[PDB]
Amino acid sequence: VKPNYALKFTLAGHTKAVSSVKFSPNGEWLASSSADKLIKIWGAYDGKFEKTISGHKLGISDVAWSSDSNLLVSASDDKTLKIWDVSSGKCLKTLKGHSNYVFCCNFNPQSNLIVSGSFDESVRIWDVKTGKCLKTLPAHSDPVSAVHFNRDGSLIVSSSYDGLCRIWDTASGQCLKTLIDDDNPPVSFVKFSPNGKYILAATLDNTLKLWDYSKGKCLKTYTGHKNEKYCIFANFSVTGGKWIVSGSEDNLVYIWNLQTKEIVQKLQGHTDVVISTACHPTENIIASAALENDKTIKLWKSDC
């Protein structure tokens, strides 16, 4: 009925705000990105520092893993994405085309494509092998905060400060759906559920919503956290009980019961805004990352 996440490790090494944490799909690693221009890799289960990957000329907003856990893509204020071979540390490609800061990135499940979102208000779809931009979608009328492929990679969901969530046909680039409820505050985060049936979206009015995107309807609302300024990443936790996990501008990690919308746990320990959370793919493990006054990542574990 409630999880019991408790602090296991604190991962220190970044010298500026940590922007994003992601578990590799094989569960072995955690990748982090930071305003210090670095990506760091850490052991998912022991928190042990593994390696630093360098190359971007300015801060990094996001990182994401290929399905086989061998590659990473990073999104940077230097207006590029980079594709990295994690084992070698090599920069395989630099993806150039956005006209301003790149805020978000994801591989498709096949991992032959990358999707990015930018301050330039576009969503771009890239070929992984060539590094070429395949499509530029004039997706929004304000900065794009998140981009995510669905389960089979046929759809992309995007969120923007224009107050909309939009769903795109990956093959054609056509907009298939615009989601909007009874108001349009900036949408700061969106992703598909693991089964691809729902979309979780955050807005800068301290709210998370669960949407049925086939039906175009909001099913659940989660509140009690603080989120009016930063684009804070949230997740579905599915390995034990079914939770919603998010960071918060009061420095806590919030966990909600997905069905009942009740807050079930608030994880204390960070000293600044928790801007990113991630949920381990097979174990009940959460990673959280915090901003400039904290500079650390924390790994929490629960029995359920």
Residue 19 binding ligand 37F, by CB under 6 A: yes
Residue 118 binding ligand 37F, by CB under 6 A: no
Give the interface segment with ligand 37F, choosing from 13-21, 125-133, 169-177, 202-210 (CB under 6 A): 13-21
Question: Is 87 or 259 the residue whose CB approaches Cl ion more closely?
Answer: 87
Residue of the chain from 145, 203, 235, 248 that contacts ligand 37F (CB under 6 A): 145
Cβ-closest residue to ligand 37F?
Answer: 59
Give the interface segment with ligand 37F, choosing from 56-64, 65-73, 120-128, 252-260 (CB under 6 A): 56-64
Question: Is 189 or 257 the residue whose CB approaches ligand 37F more closely?
Answer: 189
Residue 108 binding ligand 37F, by CB under 6 A: no
Q: Among residue numbers 33 through 52, which ones bind Cl ion (CB under 5 A)?
A: 51-52
Binding mask 50-69 for Cl ion (x = CB under 5 A): -xx-----------------
Question: Is 40 or 298 the residue whose CB approaches Cl ion more closely?
Answer: 40
Contact (CB, 8 A) for 89 and 120:
no
Length of the chain: 304
Q: What is the DSSP secondary-structure string of 90-116?
A: -EEEEE---SS-EEEEEE-SSSSEEEE
Residue 90 binding Cl ion, by CB under 5 A: no
Give the interface segment with ligand 37F, choosing from 3-11, 59-67, 89-97, 204-212 (CB under 6 A): 59-67
Q: Among residue numbers 174 through 213, which ones bind ligand 37F (CB under 6 A)?
A: none
| CA nearest neighbour of 283 among 18, 44, 4 | 44
- Residues pairing with 168 in the sheet: 156, 175
Token code pair at residue 139: 């997706």
| φ/ψ (deg, to 5) at 75 | -120, 125
Residue of the chain from 42, 103, 126, 149 that contacts ligand 37F (CB under 6 A): 103
Q: 182 burial class (0-12, 13-18, 19+ CB within 10 angstroms)?
A: exposed
Residue 160 binding ligand 37F, by CB under 6 A: no
Amino acid at 101: Y
Give the interface segment with ligand 37F, choosing from 12-20, 84-92, 214-222, 256-264 (CB under 6 A): 12-20
Contact (CB, 8 A) for 97 and 124:
yes
Rounded-to-integer distance, Cα 215 and Cα 253, Å: 30
Q: What's 141-209 look like in SS3? A: CCCEEEEEECCCCCEEEEEECCCCEEEEECCCCCEEEEECCCCCCCEEEEEECCCCCEEEEEECCCEEE
Q: Among residue numbers 30 through 49, which ones bind ligand 37F (CB under 6 A)?
A: 35
Interface residues with ligand 37F (CB under 6 A) are: 17, 19-20, 35, 59-62, 77, 103-104, 143, 145, 161, 231, 233, 275-276, 291
Interface residues with Cl ion (CB under 5 A) are: 51-52
